[PDB]
């Protein structure tokens, strides 16, 4: 059993700070819950700490932790996100949505003691003040997807790619594109996989005792061979 591994064989407390900046418009989020990366399972509830989010809070998602994926005991020898801990990995992703804006995003995800943080900064540009994210044109639920991983040797890394399909509130579909970069933070050694996936679904859902603009998310994610 890794080191890495045994940080997740339990309960660990989560916690997610976003800054970002889309078009000019500033905002915070915060997000605490939990995972059990036994069952592949998150439980999160995100707050914007700044008032009203300027972007619809699904667009976020994939921004705000993929430690806690499953992967099945066959596949244990793949779970770079797991290995590189608690030193940390940096996240980077460019999320391109089709005929509008783009999000750039740098993460740290690392242990802060017990705690497992997902610091973000965020930048968009590009998007349309009439479009379907600024427009907040974007249906309140969340499709299943799969996330593809190849190693990325080179930098001791993974890159992931994959296409998050948003339901549009006229019946169609807001494609955001997503390339993404995973190096470790410390020079440990880390493991990387051959090709797999990341078969993720996510449920999202609202407190009704809350008034602060937020985002109450579950989800389940497993490692699959295919």
Do not use: W
Not at 134 to 162: M, P, R
Not at 191 to 219: G, I
């Amino acid at each position: 059993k890794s080191k890495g591994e045994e940080l997740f064989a339990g309960v660990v407390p989560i916690l997610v700070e976003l800054d970002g900046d889309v078009n000019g418009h500033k905002f915070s989020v915060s997000g605490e819950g939990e995972g059990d990366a036994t069952y592949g399972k998150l439980t999160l509830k995100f707050i914007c700490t700044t008032g009203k989010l300027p972007v619809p809070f699904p667009t976020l998602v994939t921004t705000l932790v993929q430690c806690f994926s499953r992967y099945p005991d066959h596949m244990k020898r793949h779970d770079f996100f797991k290995s590189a801990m608690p030193e940390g990995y940096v996240q980077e992703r460019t999320i391109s949505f089709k005929d509008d804006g783009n999000y750039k995003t740098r993460a740290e995800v690392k242990f802060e003691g017990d705690t497992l943080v997902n610091r973000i900064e965020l930048k968009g540009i590009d998007f349309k003040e009439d479009g379907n994210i600024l427009g907040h044109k974007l249906e309140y639920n969340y499709n299943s997807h799969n996330v593809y991983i190849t190693a990325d040797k080179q930098k001791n890394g993974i890159k992931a790619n994959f296409k998050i399909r948003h339901n549009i509130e006229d019946g169609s579909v807001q494609l955001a594109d997503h390339y993404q970069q995973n190096t470790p933070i410390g020079d440990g050694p880390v493991l990387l996989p051959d090709n797999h996936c990341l078969s993720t679904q996510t449920v999202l859902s609202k407190d009704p005792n809350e008034k602060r603009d937020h985002m109450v998310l579950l989800e389940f994610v497993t490692a699959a061979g295919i």
